[PDB]
Swiss-Prot record, chain A:
Assembly information from the UniProt record: Component of the Mediator complex, which is composed of MED1, MED4, MED6, MED7, MED8, MED9, MED10, MED11, MED12, MED13, MED13L, MED14, MED15, MED16, MED17, MED18, MED19, MED20, MED21, MED22, MED23, MED24, MED25, MED26, MED27, MED29, MED30, MED31, CCNC, CDK8 and CDC2L6/CDK11. The MED12, MED13, CCNC and CDK8 subunits form a distinct module termed the CDK8 module. Mediator containing the CDK8 module is less active than Mediator lacking this module in supporting transcriptional activation.
Summary of the function given for this chain in its UniProt record: Component of the Mediator complex, a coactivator involved in the regulated transcription of nearly all RNA polymerase II-dependent genes. Mediator functions as a bridge to convey information from gene-specific regulatory proteins to the basal RNA polymerase II transcription machinery. Mediator is recruited to promoters by direct interactions with regulatory proteins and serves as a scaffold for the assembly of a functional preinitiation complex with RNA polymerase II and the general transcription factors. Required for cholesterol-dependent gene regulation.
Domain of life: Eukaryota
Compartments (UniProt record): Cytoplasm; Nucleus
PTM section of the record: Ubiquitinated by TRIM11, leading to proteasomal degradation.
Gene name of this polypeptide: Med15
Species assigned in the record: Mus musculus (Mouse)
Family, as annotated: Belongs to the Mediator complex subunit 15 family.
Name of the molecule in the record: Mediator of RNA polymerase II transcription subunit 15
UniProtKB/Swiss-Prot annotation, chain B:
Domain of life, source organism: Eukaryota
WD repeats mapped onto the chain: 69-110, 189-228
Name of the protein in its database record: Mediator of RNA polymerase II transcription subunit 16
Primary role: Component of the Mediator complex, a coactivator involved in the regulated transcription of nearly all RNA polymerase II-dependent genes. Mediator functions as a bridge to convey information from gene-specific regulatory proteins to the basal RNA polymerase II transcription machinery. Mediator is recruited to promoters by direct interactions with regulatory proteins and serves as a scaffold for the assembly of a functional preinitiation complex with RNA polymerase II and the general transcription factors.
Similarity annotation: Belongs to the Mediator complex subunit 16 family.
Subcellular location: Nucleus
Native species: Mus musculus
Record text on subunit structure and interactions: Component of the Mediator complex, which is composed of MED1, MED4, MED6, MED7, MED8, MED9, MED10, MED11, MED12, MED13, MED13L, MED14, MED15, MED16, MED17, MED18, MED19, MED20, MED21, MED22, MED23, MED24, MED25, MED26, MED27, MED29, MED30, MED31, CCNC, CDK8 and CDC2L6/CDK11. The MED12, MED13, CCNC and CDK8 subunits form a distinct module termed the CDK8 module. Mediator containing the CDK8 module is less active than Mediator lacking this module in supporting transcriptional activation.
Swiss-Prot record, chain C:
The protein's assembly and partners: Component of the Mediator complex, which is composed of MED1, MED4, MED6, MED7, MED8, MED9, MED10, MED11, MED12, MED13, MED13L, MED14, MED15, MED16, MED17, MED18, MED19, MED20, MED21, MED22, MED23, MED24, MED25, MED26, MED27, MED29, MED30, MED31, CCNC, CDK8 and CDC2L6/CDK11. The MED12, MED13, CCNC and CDK8 subunits form a distinct module termed the CDK8 module. Mediator containing the CDK8 module is less active than Mediator lacking this module in supporting transcriptional activation.
Keyword check for Transcription regulation: yes
Name the record gives this protein: Mediator of RNA polymerase II transcription subunit 29
Alphabetically ordered keywords of this record: Acetylation, Activator, Nucleus, Transcription, Transcription regulation
Gene: Med29
GO CC annotations, alphabetized: core mediator complex; mediator complex; nucleoplasm; nucleus
Length: 167, 237, 123
């Protein structure tokens, strides 16, 4: 109901801001009498330096941390400074039969995409009969993942397919 | 020199200085004694009376209050000003501002209200302090008791523009290109900075446009060199 | 000589009216100061103080708070003792009531002192 102050403060468009001070500060300083209402001292040069200048996209680092001791990823001759940021060599060292490591070059780690690279498909999979069956079912299974994720999801799918087509 | 006055015998602006030989109390008598006609230069007196003339209106009070507190842990406290000439100029400013407030209702505030004529009492105190300051005499009695009485009007917390120093005493200093190393009233200071805020070399920190109409005399006086602070400086918000 | 609830009921609407007048005088003083400091002279009329209003509003608020605090303390101290003894004043004699209260205070003080001494002797 007492919209008078509201409409006046809204009408007060001009740039000069000293009327509110001279109009209110006397009354408040008379009633409230703090010589230092905020006696804490504040003199701050906030930012000195904040950069490691050696970090790859941190989101990928989280996944490489969450990886199981069975998996292990690395880096090849890397076109992966900051944008691609990955084309790894993940050897699925586990209890069952081993295989050939894929590249899995992923996009920016924000991940509005997935990894799959499929580089060494040409000679590695056609050469062996078992490796040929490994690729077969694994492609069909990867054509099912809705928006797969780079390290954990794709690596686990690869291991599961490798140890499932093994039969 | 702001006076766009009428004809006069000789330099009507000098009468405000010749008014020294006048009565102590009741400036209303002193003004009729000296002159009352040729002291109106512009009907738009609403240019410096409310914004600029509040400075002297508060400084007179802060000087009067600082008198009975000589026991403070400081030689003058904040300021002493026991020379007399400055006090005489202050009294002349009080006379001309009384004339202004008589011409137009935008005078210096009572600083709250309820002075039954706050200007009259302030002028009486100024003159009582000024009489025994004029020409080689002792200084203050009843004045010390009168200044002790505070009306329901007196504010405090005046700007008092000061300048930080550079105390690199005798050994060494180690600064940086940035990241400063810790060791004016014409508006010019809202609660939070929201204008140009063209600082100066020592204390000024005055806005650039000032958002005014006819007080550009001060602006032209300050755009150029200043009180050893002509190096005006721009500082962001 | 009214009840605290009556004082509260008679203070609340005066409080609302004081708040309304406070907002009104604040708006008037602010618009006058702006017209006298930004634009042209238009408000050539004596305005109120806006301080003699806010002080009175704060006084009314504080007095209402004090009345309600007194009523709360009264009801609290009357509730806990009502469940500790029957009503007997012009069902029990006054000297017996005083002796029972003295014995109760003594027993509570003894329990507190014993517990404090044991807690201090524990370490």
């Amino acid at each position: 109901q007492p919209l008078l102050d509201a409409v006046l403060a809204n009408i007060r468009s001009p740039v000069f801001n000293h009327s509110l001070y001279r109009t209110f500060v006397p009354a408040m300083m008379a009633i409230h009498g703090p010589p230092i209402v905020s006696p804490v001292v504040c003199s701050r040069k906030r930012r000195f330096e904040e950069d490691e200048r050696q970090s790859i996209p941190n989101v990928l680092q989280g996944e490489v941390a969450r990886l199981d001791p069975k998996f292990l990823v690395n880096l090849d001759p890397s076109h992966c400074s900051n944008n691609g940021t990955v084309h790894l060599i993940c050897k699925l060292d586990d209890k069952d039969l081993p295989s050939v490591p894929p590249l899995e070059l992923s996009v920016p780690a924000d991940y509005p995409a997935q990894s799959p690279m499929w580089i060494d498909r040409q000679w590695q999979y056609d050469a062996n009969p078992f490796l040929q069956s490994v690729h077969r079912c694994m492609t069909s299974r990867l054509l099912q993942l809705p928006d797969k994720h780079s390290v954990t999801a794709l690596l686990n799918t690869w291991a599961q397919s490798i140890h499932q087509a093994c039969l | 020199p702001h006076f766009l006055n009428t004809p006069d015998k000789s330099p009507g602006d000098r009468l405000a200085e010749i008014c020294a030989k006048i009565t102590d109390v009741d400036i209303d008598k002193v003004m009729i004694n000296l002159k009352t006609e040729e002291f109106v230069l512009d009907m738009n007196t609403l240019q410096a009376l409310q914004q600029l003339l509040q400075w002297v209106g508060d400084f007179v009070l802060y000087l009067l209050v600082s008198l009975p507190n000589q026991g403070s842990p400081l030689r003058p406290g904040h300021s002493f000003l026991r020379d007399g000439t400055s006090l005489g100029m202050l009294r002349e400013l009080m006379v001309v501002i009384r004339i202004w407030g008589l011409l137009k209702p935008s005078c210096l505030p009572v600083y709250t209200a309820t002075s039954d004529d706050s200007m009259s009492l302030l002028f009486r105190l100024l003159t009582k302090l000024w009489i025994c300051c004029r020409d080689e005499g002792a200084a203050s009695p009843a004045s010390d008791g009168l200044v002790s009485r505070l009306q329901p009007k007196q504010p405090l917390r005046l700007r008092f523009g000061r300048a930080p120093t550079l105390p690199s005493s005798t050994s060494t200093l180690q600064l940086d290109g940035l990241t400063r190393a810790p060791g004016l009233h014409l508006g010019a200071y809202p609660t939070e900075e929201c204008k140009a805020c063209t600082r100066c070399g020592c204390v000024t920190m005055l806005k650039s446009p000032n958002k005014t109409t006819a007080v550009t005399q001060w602006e032209q006086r300050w755009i150029k060199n200043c009180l050893c602070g002509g190096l005006w400086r721009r500082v962001p918000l | 000589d009214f009840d605290p609830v009556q004082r509260y009921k008679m203070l609340i609407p005066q409080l609302k009216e004081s708040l309304q007048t406070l907002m009104k005088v604040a708006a008037q003083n602010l618009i006058q100061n702006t017209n006298i400091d930004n634009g042209q002279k238009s408000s050539d009329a004596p305005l109120q103080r806006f301080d003699k209003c806010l002080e009175e509003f704060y006084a009314l608020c504080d007095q209402l708070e004090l009345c309600l605090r007194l009523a709360h303390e009264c009801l609290s101290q009357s509730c806990d003792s009502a469940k500790h003894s029957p009503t007997l004043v012009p069902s029990l004699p006054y000297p017996q009531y005083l002796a029972v209260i003295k014995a109760q205070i003594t027993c509570a003080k003894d329990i507190h002192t014993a517990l404090l001494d044991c807690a201090n002797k524990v370490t």
